[PDB]
Amino acid sequence: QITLLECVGKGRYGEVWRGSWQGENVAVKIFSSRDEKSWFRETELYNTVMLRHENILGFIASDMTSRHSSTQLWLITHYHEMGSLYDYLQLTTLDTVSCLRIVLSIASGLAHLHIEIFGTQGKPAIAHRDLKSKNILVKKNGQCCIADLGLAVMHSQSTNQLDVGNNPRVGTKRYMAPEVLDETIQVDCFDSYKRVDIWAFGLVLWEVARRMVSNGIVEDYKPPFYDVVPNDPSFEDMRKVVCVDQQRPNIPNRWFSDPTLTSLAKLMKECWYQNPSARLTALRIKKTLTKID
Amino acid sequence: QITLLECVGKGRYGEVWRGSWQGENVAVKIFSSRDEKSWFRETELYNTVMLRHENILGFIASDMTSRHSSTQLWLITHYHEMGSLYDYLQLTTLDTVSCLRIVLSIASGLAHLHIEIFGTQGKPAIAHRDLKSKNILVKKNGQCCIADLGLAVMHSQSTNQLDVGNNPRVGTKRYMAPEVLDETIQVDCFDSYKRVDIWAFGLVLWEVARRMVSNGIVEDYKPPFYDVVPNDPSFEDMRKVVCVDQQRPNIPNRWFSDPTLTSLAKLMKECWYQNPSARLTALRIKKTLTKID
Numbered sequence: 248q249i250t251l252l253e254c255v256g257k258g259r260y261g262e263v264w265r266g267s268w269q270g271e272n273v274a275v276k277i278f279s280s281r282d283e284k285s286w287f288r289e290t291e292l293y294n295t296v297m298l299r300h301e302n303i304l305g306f307i308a309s310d311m312t313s314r315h316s317s318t319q320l321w322l323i324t325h326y327h328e329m330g331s332l333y334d335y336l337q338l339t340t341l342d343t344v345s346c347l348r349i350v351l352s353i354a355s356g357l358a359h360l361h362i363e364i365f366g367t368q369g370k371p372a373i374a375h376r377d378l379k380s381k382n383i384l385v386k387k388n389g390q391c392c393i394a395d396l397g398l399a400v401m402h403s404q405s406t407n408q409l410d411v412g413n414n415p416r417v418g419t420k421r422y423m424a425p426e427v428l429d430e431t432i433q434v435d436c437f438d439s440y441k442r443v444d445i446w447a448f449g450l451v452l453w454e455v456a457r458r459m460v461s462n463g464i465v466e467d468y469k470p471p472f473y474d475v476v477p478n479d480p481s482f483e484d485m486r487k488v489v490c491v492d493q494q495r496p497n498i499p500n501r502w503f504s505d506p507t508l509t510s511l512a513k514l515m516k517e518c519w520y521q522n523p524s525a526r527l528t529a530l531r532i533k534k535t536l537t538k539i540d
Numbered sequence: 541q542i543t544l545l546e547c548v549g550k551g552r553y554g555e556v557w558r559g560s561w562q563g564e565n566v567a568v569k570i571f572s573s574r575d576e577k578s579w580f581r582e583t584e585l586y587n588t589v590m591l592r593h594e595n596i597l598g599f600i601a602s603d604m605t606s607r608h609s610s611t612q613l614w615l616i617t618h619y620h621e622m623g624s625l626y627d628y629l630q631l632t633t634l635d636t637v638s639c640l641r642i643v644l645s646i647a648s649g650l651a652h653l654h655i656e657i658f659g660t661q662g663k664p665a666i667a668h669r670d671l672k673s674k675n676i677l678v679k680k681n682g683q684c685c686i687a688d689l690g691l692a693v694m695h696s697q698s699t700n701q702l703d704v705g706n707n708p709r710v711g712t713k714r715y716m717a718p719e720v721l722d723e724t725i726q727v728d729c730f731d732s733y734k735r736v737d738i739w740a741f742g743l744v745l746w747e748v749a750r751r752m753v754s755n756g757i758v759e760d761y762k763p764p765f766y767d768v769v770p771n772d773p774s775f776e777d778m779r780k781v782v783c784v785d786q787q788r789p790n791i792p793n794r795w796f797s798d799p800t801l802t803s804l805a806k807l808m809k810e811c812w813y814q815n816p817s818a819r820l821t822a823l824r825i826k827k828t829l830t831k832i833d
């Protein structure tokens with residue numbers, strides 16, 4: 248039994264509630280009609296794959312109920328009262344320690360998605376296909392975990408057939424990679440999807456770093472490409488910024504005072520190449536941020 | 541946790557296993573790729589509607605797992621070791637008491653599907669759309685329960701929108717009603733589907749009655765229309781038997797010695813009209829068989 252208590256988010260993706268499962272606080276994502284398929288892929292992933300990781304949004308159950316003589320699709324997960332990284336960054340500013348932890352954990356979590364593992368706690372490789380700051384949740388110990396797997400893709404070296412499902416939804420156009428904005432992404436190849444994930448991590452990286460203080464100054468929060476595209480950008484908008492003009496988020500010049508911000512800037516630059524074969528891997532990213540301080 | 545133990549049925553619908561849930565005997569229907577949608581509709585029904593009834597196949601859970609780096613859809617229900625009414629009728633012959641009980645319980649179960657109920661143990665009206673002897677299971681107390689809701693349809697007087705889902709599967713052509721074999725069934729109207737259920741009950745009625753002894757004689761088991769159509773009949777086969785030649789299952793003349801078999805024969809005749817508006821309702825059927833002995 249489950250009781251929704253407190254709606255914490257309304258949107259085009261549906262709604263997220265704080266609920267109780269047996270009095271225990273949990274999060275209930277009610278999917279909208281437009282996303283049935285995203286509920287299925289995500290329920291498919293969490294149930295057929297072990298995903299238990301500190302930096303992946305923890306799963307409890309998936310369920311179907313009826314409000315108003317009509318069916319609602321719920322996903323039921325761990326609840327994080329600080330909320331999304333997007334909300335957190337607006338609310339607050341960061342020091343070096345807190346900055347790196349946030350970005351290390353996103354990479355410690357994405358790497359775990361990205362790689363195949365074997366044995367009793369094994370898993371196929373997974374790509375997210377919708378990495379962004381609104382799809383990351385921030386935990387009381389100030390580590391993040393990755394939410395929203397409704398677009399995800401799987402692969403094993405055991406079988407070597409690609410399972411992309413059949414979801415009519417696409418990414419968030421703001422974080423789309425150039426190959427995707429091109430419609431030149433080779434959908435036949437699994438790594439394509441990883442590399443698409445790496446791009447989006449570079450932009451996330453960029454959103455967080457702005458909120459780290461150095462010489463007593465931060466930039467305000469902005470979404471990527473905030474200066475050059477309107478809210479809810481057309482597909483043909485992002486295409487001209489990213490593919491045609493070939494633009495990227497600016498590095499503020501104050502970052503070049505600081506070695507941490509210069510390091511992270513070196514790093515996000517490596518996530519941002521137009522050729523996807525050239526971008527870094529999550530595991531490189533993880534191990535790199537492991538050294539930086 | 542669940543462990544399949546013993547496969548009890550392979551077929552085009554997939555497989556049914558005897559399993560354990562926590563050591564408890566249960567039935568695991570593994571759906572084939574061809575039926576995803578039937579798993580969803582059936583998981584939709586059982587979860588969003590209370591269906592707890594002695595003559596409806598009892599639900600425990602629905603689940604997704606991965607054998608061979610690929611996803612299987614399970615439904616997990618009560619297990620009935622005697623198996624399907626189809627298998628039971630071949631195995632055995634019936635007296636009056638056992639005959640009526642079997643057919644009363646099918647009607648006590650279909651009626652419960654067919655009607656809307658209100659309050660704390662309420663339910664919308666449901667049509668089955670695939671009633672047959674293989675979709676009925678026989679219980680140790682020799683009452684039956686209705687299985688397989690993957691084609692089902694729902695309706696409330698509360699809302700009055702029809703929810704037919706979107707399942708590319710059709711009935712079993714052997715039990716298709718003439719309006720369905722016509723492609724003249726008005727898919728906009730809910731009762732159409734009930735009446736289709738009533739037809740199929742008439743044929744089921746006919747299959748069982750053959751196995752009731754009277755004057756020391758039974759007929760062998762046959763599927764409906766066994767004399768005039770081959771195994772796995774074409775759509776255009778059943779059409780010519782039912783719609784064009786306008787045929788029905790014969791009443792054996794020995795039944796007209798017996799009042800019970802004459803009564804049930806009167807009854808199944810009332811399920812078999814070409815016009816669907818003229819067939820009986822499940823509740824009439826139920827209350828009629830309640831009087832007969």
Ligand SMILES: CC(=O)c1cccc(-c2cnc3ccc(NCC4CC4)nn23)c1
Nearest residue numbers: 256263274325326327330331382394395
């Ligand atoms: C990000 C997402 O899709 C999701 C899915 C299930 C649970 C949660 C979850 C758990 N705790 C919280 C606290 C806040 C929150 N905000 C939802 C809006 C940011 C997407 N989501 N959230 C998020």
Ligand SMILES: CC(=O)c1cccc(-c2cnc3ccc(NCC4CC4)nn23)c1
Nearest residue numbers: 549556567618619620623624675687688
């Ligand atoms: C009829 C059907 O689809 C179904 C679905 C879930 C469980 C069961 C069930 C429970 N106990 C038994 C025992 C035998 C059995 N036979 C499966 C073949 C007759 C369709 N099915 N079965 C049947």
